[PDB]
Amino acid sequence: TNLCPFDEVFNATRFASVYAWNRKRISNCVADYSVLYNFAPFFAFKCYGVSPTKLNDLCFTNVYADSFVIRGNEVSQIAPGQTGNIADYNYKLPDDFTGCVIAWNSNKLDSKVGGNYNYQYRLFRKSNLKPFERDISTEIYQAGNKPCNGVAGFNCYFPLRSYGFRPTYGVGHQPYRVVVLSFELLHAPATVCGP
Amino acid sequence: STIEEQAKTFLDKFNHEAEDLFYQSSLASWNYNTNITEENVQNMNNAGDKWSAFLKEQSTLAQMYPLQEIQNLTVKLQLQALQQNGSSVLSEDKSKRLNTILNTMSTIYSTGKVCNPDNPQECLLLEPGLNEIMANSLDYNERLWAWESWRSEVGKQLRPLYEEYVVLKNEMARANHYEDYGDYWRGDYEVNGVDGYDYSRGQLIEDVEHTFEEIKPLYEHLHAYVRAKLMNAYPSYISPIGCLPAHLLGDMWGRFWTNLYSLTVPFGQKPNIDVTDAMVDQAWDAQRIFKEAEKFFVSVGLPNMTQGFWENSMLTDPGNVQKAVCHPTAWDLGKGDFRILMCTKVTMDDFLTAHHEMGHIQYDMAYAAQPFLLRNGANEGFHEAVGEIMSLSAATPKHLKSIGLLSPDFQEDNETEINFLLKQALTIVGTLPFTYMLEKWRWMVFKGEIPKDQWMKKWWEMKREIVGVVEPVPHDETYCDPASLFHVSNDYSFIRYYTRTLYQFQFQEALCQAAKHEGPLHKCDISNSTEAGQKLFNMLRLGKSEPWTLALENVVGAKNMNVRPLLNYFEPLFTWLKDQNKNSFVGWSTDWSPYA
Ligand SMILES: *[C@@H]1O[C@H](CO[C@@H]2O[C@@H](C)[C@@H](O)[C@@H](O)[C@@H]2O)[C@@H](O[C@@H]2O[C@H](CO)[C@@H](O)[C@H](O)[C@H]2NC(C)=O)[C@H](O)[C@H]1NC(C)=O
Ligand SMILES: *[C@@H]1O[C@H](CO)[C@@H](O[C@@H]2O[C@H](CO)[C@@H](O)[C@H](O)[C@H]2NC(C)=O)[C@H](O)[C@H]1NC(C)=O
Ligand SMILES: *[C@@H]1O[C@H](CO)[C@@H](O)[C@H](O)[C@H]1NC(C)=O
Numbered sequence: 001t002n003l004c005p006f007d008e009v010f011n012a013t014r015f016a017s018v019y020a021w022n023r024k025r026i027s028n029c030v031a032d033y034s035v036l037y038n039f040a041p042f043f044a045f046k047c048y049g050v051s052p053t054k055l056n057d058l059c060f061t062n063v064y065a066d067s068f069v070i071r072g073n074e075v076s077q078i079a080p081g082q083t084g085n086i087a088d089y090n091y092k093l094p095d096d097f098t099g100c101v102i103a104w105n106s107n108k109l110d111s112k113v114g115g116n117y118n119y120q121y122r123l124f125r126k127s128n129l130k131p132f133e134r135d136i137s138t139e140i141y142q143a144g145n146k147p148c149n150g151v152a153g154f155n156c157y158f159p160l161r162s163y164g165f166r167p168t169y170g171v172g173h174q175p176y177r178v179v180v181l182s183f184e185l186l187h188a189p190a191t192v193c194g195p
Numbered sequence: 196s197t198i199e200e201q202a203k204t205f206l207d208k209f210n211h212e213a214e215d216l217f218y219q220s221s222l223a224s225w226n227y228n229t230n231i232t233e234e235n236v237q238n239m240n241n242a243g244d245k246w247s248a249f250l251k252e253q254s255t256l257a258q259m260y261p262l263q264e265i266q267n268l269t270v271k272l273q274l275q276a277l278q279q280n281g282s283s284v285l286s287e288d289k290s291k292r293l294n295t296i297l298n299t300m301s302t303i304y305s306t307g308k309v310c311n312p313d314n315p316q317e318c319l320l321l322e323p324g325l326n327e328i329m330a331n332s333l334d335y336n337e338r339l340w341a342w343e344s345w346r347s348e349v350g351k352q353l354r355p356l357y358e359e360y361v362v363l364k365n366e367m368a369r370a371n372h373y374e375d376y377g378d379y380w381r382g383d384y385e386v387n388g389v390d391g392y393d394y395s396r397g398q399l400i401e402d403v404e405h406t407f408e409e410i411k412p413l414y415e416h417l418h419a420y421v422r423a424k425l426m427n428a429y430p431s432y433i434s435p436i437g438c439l440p441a442h443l444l445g446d447m448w449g450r451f452w453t454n455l456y457s458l459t460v461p462f463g464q465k466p467n468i469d470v471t472d473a474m475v476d477q478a479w480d481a482q483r484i485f486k487e488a489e490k491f492f493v494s495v496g497l498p499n500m501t502q503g504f505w506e507n508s509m510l511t512d513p514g515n516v517q518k519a520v521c522h523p524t525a526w527d528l529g530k531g532d533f534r535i536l537m538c539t540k541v542t543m544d545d546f547l548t549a550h551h552e553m554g555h556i557q558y559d560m561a562y563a564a565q566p567f568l569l570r571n572g573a574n575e576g577f578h579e580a581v582g583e584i585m586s587l588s589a590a591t592p593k594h595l596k597s598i599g600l601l602s603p604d605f606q607e608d609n610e611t612e613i614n615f616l617l618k619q620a621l622t623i624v625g626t627l628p629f630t631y632m633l634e635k636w637r638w639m640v641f642k643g644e645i646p647k648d649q650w651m652k653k654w655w656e657m658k659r660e661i662v663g664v665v666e667p668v669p670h671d672e673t674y675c676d677p678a679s680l681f682h683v684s685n686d687y688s689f690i691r692y693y694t695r696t697l698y699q700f701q702f703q704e705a706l707c708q709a710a711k712h713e714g715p716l717h718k719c720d721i722s723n724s725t726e727a728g729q730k731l732f733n734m735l736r737l738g739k740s741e742p743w744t745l746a747l748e749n750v751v752g753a754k755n756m757n758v759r760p761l762l763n764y765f766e767p768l769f770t771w772l773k774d775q776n777k778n779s780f781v782g783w784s785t786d787w788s789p790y791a
């Protein structure tokens with residue numbers, strides 16, 4: 001039997017910034033969802049379109065796992081039909097979403113004395129973001145009428161900013177790791193099935 | 196892209212760059228105030244320089260979005276708070292001279308030393324020393340010696356500095372489209388915009404005068420009582436129809452009359468309520484005090500304290516290992532970090548100060564959601580008025596019996612109530628005339644009503660007319676008496692104490708009405724009243740986002756500063772004093788002088 005690789009997704013050494021979030025296509029393997037119940041402190045285990053109990057005996061074609069690191073106050077922005085800075089410029093979920101959202105605290109790993117400046121998030125974008133879209137552009141944001149011409153100054157800002165994680169911040173400003181599961185079923189034959 | 200959108204984007208960038216820089220400055224300052232090391236001071240100074248540079252650079256950028264173009268009443272408040280120039284409007288030479296003058300006044304106040312006659316090997320500083328002589332000594336010539344010395348050496352060394360300080364602080368204000376430096380100070384109370392809730396900078400003088408015209412009877416009766424009780428300690432120095440000499444008020448300047456309780460106690464056989472020995476015999480520590488305060492706050496509906504509060508806060512004196520600054524402070528480092536620095540001791544005083552500081556911290560926790568530039572109190576007097584009322588409810592005998600620190604068979608006699616009320620009045624009521632006098636004098640000096648050669652004359656004419664205190668020896672134009680006070684030599688506002696005193700009793704009366712308390716107002720406790728906690732939280736969460744006229748209405752029901760609640764707090768004392776002063780003279784004459 002070949003178990004699905006949910007181990008290397010949840011328990012990775014390093015994660016990715018929100019604006020460039022990883023995606024793994026978990027396919028053609030049997031998936032045991034009892035492994036996910038490890039890591040007992042879960043700040044959120046909200047599930048949409050399914051129920052956690054019966055998730056085993058209902059099997060699909062492709063499963064996508066998306067991972068990134070946000071702050072605590074923004075965990076509520078990874079529900080369908082929400083509005084905010086992260087949900088509009090960084091990661092957007094469709095209104096008809098099916099799947100689960102998992103978030104757990106990672107203060108002891110992602111916060112250092114002096115600051116962890118390797119996690120970044122987008123602050124300025126021209127228009128909103130269509131569902132499941134990834135933008136890694138770093139062009140200068142033009143907020144005025146005078147062309148920027150690839151520099152920064154009056155009404156010409158740098159789109160990406162950096163978190164300042166420290167081991168002394170509050171619960172709302174401490175790092176959190178989020179993994180989002182998307183279940184796709186289609187007329188193409190179903191492959192990923194449980195026990 | 197209109198101007199408003201550009202302003203919103205600029206504010207969004209500023210709000211992210213300011214939080215980080217301010218957090219690094221605040222953490223450096225905390226580390227300096229906990230330890231003491233040459234390295235920690237250097238780190239503090241570097242972080243402070245970085246923060247000051249960031250603010251200096253950003254104000255120039257904000258002066259490119261015209262103020263009239265924006266109609267949001269929230270972006271305008273934040274941009275206005277960035278657009279102040281300060282002392283940058285002046286030329287470089289004048290700015291350097293002003294900074295030098297301020298530094299010189301501070302360093303001449305800080306290390307002022309007076310020497311007794313014909314004995315150079317014995318000289319005293321301000322603290323300790325002269326503060327102990329005028330707080331515990333019953334000799335007359337000993338107090339007058341210190342009072343004259345302090346204004347002879349230190350007082351006379353500041354007037355030439357003070358004149359140029361005034362003339363230079365008027366130029367900065369006039370370059371900022373004000374009338375004088377006095378109007379600049381009155382800008383903390385200005386509300387422009389929202390209809391009905393408007394307050395002008397000139398209305399504050401009228402409001403203060405109207406409120407002070409009502410406190411005069413109670414102050415007169417207190418003054419007559421203290422005068423009657425002071426003739427028995429200095430038999431042949433105080434006139435029964437005159438004014439109190441300025442050096443017999445328990446302090447160098449007469450700001451507080453607390454140290455007169457020994458001489459003016461109504462009933463000396465019955466002692467006050469002290470729970471210091473009860474706490475020790477129950478084996479209490481600092482942690483117990485702070486958990487009791489937290490339990491008090493949760494009953495009214497306010498939230499708990501953060502898990503970081505119990506880990507990153509100092510609540511005990513470290514000892515000989517570390518050198519710390521033992522001053523009770525409440526810190527809001529930003530980004531969810533809340534701490535308290537306090538060298539807690541087992542004493543009722545620390546028991547009350549814990550409630551006070553926790554009230555500060557709760558107010559800080561309330562407005563964490565607002566933008567950075569709107570994370571302060573409604574005005575300069577709301578914060579510690581909110582902090583103070585929590586200590587009033589923690590000292591009432593009803594609260595102490597509930598927590599068990601006081602015996603359950605103790606009965607409240609009506610003779611200790613007068614003691615408590617008089618002790619409170621000697622600190623709260625005896626300082627309002629002094630505050631009003633000093634602020635009026637400073638306002639008139641800046642405007643130009645008092646000429647340069649009639650400063651001390653009008654200063655001592657106002658004291659014989661408002662406060663009721665006369666000078667012991669004559670003073671002329673070579674003296675600078677007001678500069679002898681800390682808040683005058685150092686550029687500080689002073690009306691905040693007056694406003695706070697009037698606000699706290701309004702808040703207390705509103706909460707006691709909401710808590711369905713029947714009886715005298717000074718026995719009030721807002722414990723176990725969830726309604727009285729929602730009402731306060733309806734004001735604590737706003738910050739500066741809304742005018743202070745509206746925030747007051749969310750608690751008290753009125754939209755202006757009022758004095759009747761203060762008088763309802765002192766009704767029994769007022770009646771007792773009216774009964775006690777039936778065979779004495781109430782009032783004073785502005786002709787008698789000790790040197791006459
Ligand atoms: C605040 O309330 C607590 C809880 O008491 C209960 O709730 C009150 C609203 C009221 O309905 C009480 O009758 C309830 O029992 C009080 O704590 C109790 O105080 C009584 C005093 O008679 C004591 O016998 C109990 O052991 C206490 N229970 C505890 C400590 O868990 C508290 O005294 C109230 N404080 C006030 C009124 O100031
Ligand atoms: C703060 O100072 C700056 C200049 O140091 C002021 O900006 C000037 O305002 C005058 C007023 O008419 C203009 O003529 C100038 O063009 C402005 N710029 C400069 C570089 O001088 C600014 O107004 C001051 N702030 C306030 C609130 O008055
Ligand atoms: C997570 O990875 C670490 C390191 O490989 C391992 O020790 C730990 O057991 C893993 N956790 C789980 C739940 O497998």
Ligand SMILES: *[C@@H]1O[C@H](CO)[C@@H](O)[C@H](O)[C@H]1NC(C)=O
Nearest residue numbers: 229230231232234235516517
């Ligand atoms: C600050 O105080 C702690 C407590 O003893 C000490 O360990 C530390 O060395 C001090 N800081 C410095 C820079 O010495």
Ligand SMILES: *[C@@H]1O[C@H](CO)[C@@H](O)[C@H](O)[C@H]1NC(C)=O
Nearest residue numbers: 199203266267268269270271
């Ligand atoms: C002012 O701008 C803020 C933007 O956060 C908006 O929420 C608010 O409604 C605006 N005020 C008015 C009166 O529209």
Ligand SMILES: *[C@@H]1O[C@H](CO)[C@@H](O)[C@H](O)[C@H]1NC(C)=O
Nearest residue numbers: 489490493496497498499500
């Ligand atoms: C505050 O903390 C105590 C113990 O930590 C807990 O019992 C109580 O429910 C908390 N209050 C709230 C409002 O969560």
Ligand SMILES: *[C@@H]1O[C@H](CO)[C@@H](O)[C@H](O)[C@H]1NC(C)=O
Nearest residue numbers: 461608609610611612613771
């Ligand atoms: C207190 O109560 C006694 C009891 O009769 C009464 O005589 C007295 O006037 C009251 N007031 C004071 C201040 O003692």
Ligand SMILES: [Zn+2]
Nearest residue numbers: 551555579582
């Ligand atoms: Zn305080």
